[PDB]
C-alpha cells in the first residue's frame, strides 16, 4: 500500500478505533490510529489556521491549530522521517464526510521545503503558496470529489449548488511536483506547511475532518476511505 504520514484535524470522535471522546488533532504514522492526539475546541463556521513544522535536527513533527482570539491546540511527536518515507514524496490535503457531513473548504495553502547537503549552504528549496485557486489549477492534482474554482477556494469534498455539504464524500489535492523531503548527505532538512480552513456544519454535528499528508509520489485514494478514514488509509488497523 501507500506510505502515509499526516496531521489530522479530526471532527468526529470514533472512539471505537482509538479516537478520543471529542474533536481533536493528531499525528498519524502509517495508521489512522494516531500516535498522539490533543483536544481541539473546533469552532463550527469559523476560519482557522493550521501550522505544521518539522526539522531533521530535532526529528520532531509539530502542529498548531488556532482560531482568531482563541486558545490554540498543539501536538508534537518525536519521529525520524528518514526511516518512514521514501526520499521523494508528494504533499497534499485530504478531507472526508460519511453519515454526518461538514464543508472542508481550504482558503489558502503554502508550503516550504529546505534541504542543505554537506557541500554546505548549497541549499535546495521548494516553495509554493496558494491564496486563491482558479477553476483550472494545473499545478494541482485533484482526486475524488475535490474541486477548485468555487471562487477562490478549494472544496475538498462535495458541496451542493446552494452550498450545503454532502455525506459520503472524499477528495484530495496534491501538489504536482514531487518533493525531496530527506537526503542522506543532508546537514539540515526542514519544511513547514500552512493552510486556512473553514469547516461548516448546518446540523451542528460535523464529520469527518481535514488532514495535511505526505506520501509516496503515486498515492491515490484507498477504497471506502470515506468518513472516519479521511481518505488516507484502507482500513483502521
Amino acid at each position: 500500500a501507500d506510505t502515509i504520514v499526516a496531521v489530522e484535524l479530526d471532527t468526529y470522535p470514533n472512539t471505537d478505533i482509538g479516537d478520543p471522546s471529542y474533536p481533536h488533532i493528531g499525528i498519524d504514522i502509517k495508521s489512522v490510529r494516531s500516535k498522539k492526539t490533543a483536544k481541539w475546541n473546533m469552532q463550527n463556521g469559523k476560519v482557522g489556521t493550521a501550522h505544521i513544522i518539522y526539522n531533521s535536527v530535532d526529528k520532531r513533527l509539530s502542529a498548531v491549530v488556532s482560531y482568531p482570539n482563541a486558545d490554540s491546540a498543539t501536538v508534537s511527536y518525536d519521529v525520524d522521517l528518514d526511516n518512514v518515507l521514501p526520499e521523494w514524496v508528494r504533499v497534499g490535503l485530504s478531507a472526508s464526510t460519511g453519515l454526518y457531513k461538514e464543508t472542508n473548504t481550504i482558503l489558502s495553502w503554502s508550503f516550504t521545503s529546505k534541504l542543505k547537503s554537506n557541500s554546505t549552504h548549497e541549499t535546495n528549496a521548494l516553495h509554493f503558496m496558494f491564496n486563491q485557486f482558479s477553476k483550472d489549477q494545473k499545478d494541482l492534482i485533484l482526486q475524488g470529489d475535490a474541486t477548485t474554482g468555487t471562487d477562490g477556494n478549494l472544496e475538498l469534498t462535495r458541496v451542493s449548488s446552494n452550498g450545503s455539504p454532502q455525506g459520503s464524500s472524499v477528495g484530495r489535492a496534491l501538489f504536482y511536483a514531487p518533493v525531496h523531503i530527506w537526503e542522506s548527505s543532508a546537514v539540515v532538512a526542514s519544511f513547514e506547511a500552512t493552510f486556512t480552513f473553514l469547516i461548516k456544519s448546518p446540523d451542528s454535528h460535523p464529520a469527518d475532518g481535514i488532514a495535511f499528508f505526505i506520501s509516496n509520489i503515486d498515492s491515490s485514494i484507498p477504497s471506502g476511505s470515506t468518513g472516519r478514514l479521511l481518505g488516507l488509509f484502507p482500513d483502521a488497523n
Binding site: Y22, P23, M42, Q43, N44, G45, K46, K200, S204, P206
Partner: peptide, 6 residues
C-alpha cells in the same frame, strides 16, 4: 453566531 456542535 455560527460556532457549535461539541
Amino acid at each position: 453566531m455560527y460556532w457549535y456542535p461539541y
